[PDB]
């Protein structure tokens, strides 16, 4: 009855639909499990109506990003603002020492650059965790590092944890260091991107609250699709764009799992084997909304470093080898806001909004999202880093005003009015893990499809832009174009 | 003629390491012939005001993560606690004559777009560095502010001091590249030279012998003649004279200083390689002051050449590259200049400045006119002192003010034994031709004969080790049964 059935209304599924329509293909459907489109692209509303992209927020690799270039062309043609280049000189804060960035003595950024080079050479032509790689660097280069560099550098370099959404002891060293193709551009409305694409094809194509539970290849070469609500569909081709984490459920037994799709026949071994990798990270976000800005806007990029110790330095100095270094690194807790690095975006400088957008990594992410409803507890957890940031930004301790009390004595003090938290690790339609946005087994299997009728798209199905919004976007255009060409050739 | 096992021509670091390696491998009766009355070649440490020392040739150990020469020096320091170098990389201070400092500027963010420029170059790869920058500007104009477009190109040119060549003459394809780790400022490259020179029989060195001819004999030996008439015969010869001096061999005129007459002549593959390589010239000027009375915030300072708001206008209006090029007296502000503030890194009240061609050739030609040198650089020197919370410089070459006591200038473009061809230190035709040699007996070493570390002191060092080892491997066969 239908030419193509797209499962998932994320950017991958939406672009696919936009492409099909663009190429004159009719009678298509987009089945989405949620009651909204966008998927991992979701803009939420907070205090005084302020908006924030709780999912994707930046356009990466702007020198080659096709989606960004499309957005840029639009703004060049209508002068409307669709993004802002917010890269900045990072401000690094240690709880005890305060700012350690661009330090005339520490020169941490310079040694971090050496660390990245060290990583590049370590895996050159290679066919270890991030933590171990850093320890290797310190042992090898200690003769050329001051005491404070050995102490702070490892905590600074961990900003990469926020790129991968994963702790350094769990992140693989080989996939940690990589370069981005140009500046990043903060999207001033990824929802505006979702909207434009979503409205580029006929409305009746969209079917929300349609949780696909099964996909079958009929003997008549037709593909049947059934949603939880009982509805049944069939088409010439199907483009599956559900997240890798959801698709992974298909290999497990019991169709019970929310989101899990029953494949008949099952996904071929090439696909199944591909899941034996990835699915560990989890990027989370916490938005702190203040009444107004009363802090320095020197930079829109701030990172708080986890606590470090001088004993750590003594150990690195005394260790005779890696094994002895590990052994010595055994002291004698409870996780606090200073137990890991945290990345804060000072939206005041970049967008003029008196709010901070903070990124966190697994294992913290899961823990914080699990208490996302307990605002008082959230404030207590982050209060110490929030106050240190304010102190370093020429301001003062944050006033908890989530339960407001108009008081003129707060005039020039930061008053927190609301906290917003992501929920991706607890969302059954996203669940699984997170991967950084990069400019192989899974990519090959996915881009290869189940067969000539069952295709796949999404951020986990492409090389260029892997784990990126533009990658998912491009992967959608890819599958749609492949099918439109085929349909056009039929006659 | 005296018989020798191996004769090395040139006592720069390549020749010295070759000799060092030959001795290490037990090879006897060798000789090192050097035209100058000193060893070291392009590694020369001079003395100035109050006995202060400066490397007027190579100064840094580059690519310290893998540099074998540096690693050897580091091991020595680790064992005797003696200081041989200092990691002096720093946050660069950028200065514009009118605007003053423009580094780490919360609004200009020049360092960030410079990084994008670099990535642009990477993804791009042949034209000139200048043209590549112009292309970047046209492609990214929509995402660059007016002041970014004005100053970025001038900041990008710090790379001119890496290659010692103006951006319009510099190959864009060879402009951008990354070093393997931080740099280490040698605290006496002369100490490196002395160590290596003392590592083989002292009777092997013969200074003041300008070699004028090398002849491959039918008996398979090689005859080497010094201009003073002395003759030597050897089984193998390792030639380490600079590429520019070797180039003389293919030109007619035997009276040319340093020129070696080869018989038979250099192979066509070698002769022809002299067509696509070299063009720049890295120069140095040392400014010695009585004492430090300025800010030691950083040891790295770069003065940007003058720019204009008209340039920005042109960039915005240009319809394309063709329309851009159409729409588009030397002073210290006509090109970028790189200054090393030694007070912070070494504690010495002096500035070591690097310059590029064509300026280098002009300045070295007038290095004897100190007053003229002072007047030429006085404006950048003053702007620097101002930005470092100081005052104008007082000429004291003959309290809270900087007093210039002396100026020292390099001489590589005028030195007949170097002839400033200069190339940047990087971690193909000439290399292959050189590494393959003239024949089994006539070999070559030097910074221009190796891929890894090409143009670097450690590259020259390694090339010497390579030729000495090859010869040792061959001589090894003489003891087989
Ligand atoms: C916290 C976070 C921050 C990020 N920040 C950035 C950033 O700054 N820049 C960037 O480029 N990228 C970023 N990303 C990545 C980017 O958001 C994703 O690459 C992109 O949105 C993935 O799009 P997609 O279409 O492949 O998948 P999705 O957007 O996940 O869409 C797939 C759709 O499938 C639906 N679905 C699932 N199961 C079923 C089912 N059984 N039946 C029907 N429908 C189903 C889902 O509900 C969903 O709408 C971020 C990701 C996260 C989690
Ligand atoms: C201004 C400047 C700055 C530099 N800075 C750095 C730096 O910071 N880091 C770095 O790694 N590298 C640097 N270099 C490069 C480095 O100095 C060279 O790579 C290295 O010294 C070259 O060594 P070589 O042995 O190949 O040649 P040379 O050192 O030139 O030695 C060859 C020798 O041959 C002799 N000779 C020539 N003709 C004859 C003849 N006919 N008979 C006998 N002897 C002859 C010469 O007098 C000379 O001593 C710099 C170079 C210059 C010019």
Curated annotation (Swiss-Prot), chain B:
Name this protein carries in UniProt: Polyamine oxidase FMS1
Instruction: Name the source organism.
Output: Saccharomyces cerevisiae (strain ATCC 204508 / S288c)
Q: Which domain of life is it from?
A: Eukaryota
Family named by the database record:
Belongs to the flavin monoamine oxidase family.
SUPFAM superfamilies registered for this protein in UniProt: FAD-linked reductases, C-terminal domain (SSF54373), FAD/NAD(P)-binding domain (SSF51905)
Which cofactors must be present for this protein to function?
A: FAD
Gene symbol here is FMS1
List the catalytic activities from the record: spermine + O2 + H2O = 3-aminopropanal + spermidine + H2O2; spermidine + O2 + H2O = 3-aminopropanal + putrescine + H2O2; N(1)-acetylspermine + O2 + H2O = 3-acetamidopropanal + spermidine + H2O2; N(1)-acetylspermidine + O2 + H2O = 3-acetamidopropanal + putrescine + H2O2
Q: Give the miscellaneous note.
A: Present with 6960 molecules/cell in log phase SD medium.
Record's cofactor remark: Binds 1 FAD per subunit.
Q: Which GO terms describe its biological process?
A: pantothenate biosynthetic process; spermine catabolic process
């Amino acid at each position: 009855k239908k030419k193509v059935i797209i499962i998932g209304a994320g950017i991958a599924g939406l672009k696919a639909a936009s492409t099909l329509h663009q190429n004159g293909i009719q009678d298509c459907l987009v089945l989405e499990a949620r009651d909204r489109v966008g998927g991992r692209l979701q803009t939420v509303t907070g205090y005084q109506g302020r908006k924030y992209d709780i999912g994707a927020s930046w356009h990466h690799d702007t020198l080659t990003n096709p989606l960004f270039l499309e957005e840029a062309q639009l703004s060049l043609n209508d002068g409307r603002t669709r993004f802002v280049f917010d890269d900045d000189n990072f401000i690094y804060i240690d709880e005890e020492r305060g700012r350690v960035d661009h330090d005339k003595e520490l020169l941490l950024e310079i040694v971090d650059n050496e660390m990245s080079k060290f990583a590049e050479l370590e895996f050159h032509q290679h066919l270890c965790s991030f933590f171990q790689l850093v320890m290797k660097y310190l042992l090898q280069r200690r003769q050329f590092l001051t005491n404070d560099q050995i102490r702070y550098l490892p905590q600074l370099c961990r900003y990469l944890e926020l790129w991968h959404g994963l702790d350094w002891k769990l992140l693989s060293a080989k996939d940690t260091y990589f370069g981005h193709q140009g500046r990043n551009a903060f999207a001033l409305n990824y929802d505006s991107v979702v909207q434009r694409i979503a409205q580029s094809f006929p409305q009746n194509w969209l079917k929300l609250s349609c949780e696909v539970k099964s996909i079958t290849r009929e003997p008549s070469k037709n593909v049947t699709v059934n949603c939880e609500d009982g509805t049944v569909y069939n088409a010439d081709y199907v483009i599956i764009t559900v997240p890798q984490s959801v698709l992974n459920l298909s290999v497990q037994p019991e169709k019970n799992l929310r989101g899990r799709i029953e494949f008949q026949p099952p996904l071929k071994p090439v696909i199944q084997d591909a899941f034996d990798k990835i699915h560990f990270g989890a990027l989370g976000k916490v938005i702190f909304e203040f009444e107004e800005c009363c802090w320095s806007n020197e930079s829109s990029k701030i990172v708080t470093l986890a606590n470090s110790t001088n004993e750590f330095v003594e150990i690195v100095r005394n260790a005779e080898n890696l094994d002895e270094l590990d052994s010595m690194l055994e002291r004698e807790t409870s996780v606090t806001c200073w137990s890991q690095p945290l990345f804060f975006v000072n939206l005041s400088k970049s967008t003029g909004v008196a709010s901070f957008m903070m990124l966190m990594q697994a294992p913290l992410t899961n823990h914080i999202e699990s208490i996302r409803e307990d605002k008082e507890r959230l404030f207590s957890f982050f209060q110490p880093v929030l106050n240190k940031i304010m102190k370093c930004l020429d301001s003062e301790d944050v006033i908890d005003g989530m339960r407001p009390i108009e008081n003129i004595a707060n005039a020039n003090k930061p008053v927190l009015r609301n906290i917003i938290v992501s929920n991706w690790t607890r969302d059954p339609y996203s669940r699984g893990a997170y991967s950084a946005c990069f400019p192989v087994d899974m990519v090959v299997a996915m881009s290869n499809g189940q067969d000539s009728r069952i295709r796949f798209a999404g951020e986990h199905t492409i090389m260029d832009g892997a784990g990126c919004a533009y990658g998912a976007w491009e992967s959608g255009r890819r599958e749609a174009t492949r099918i439109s060409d085929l349909l056009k050739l039929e006659h």
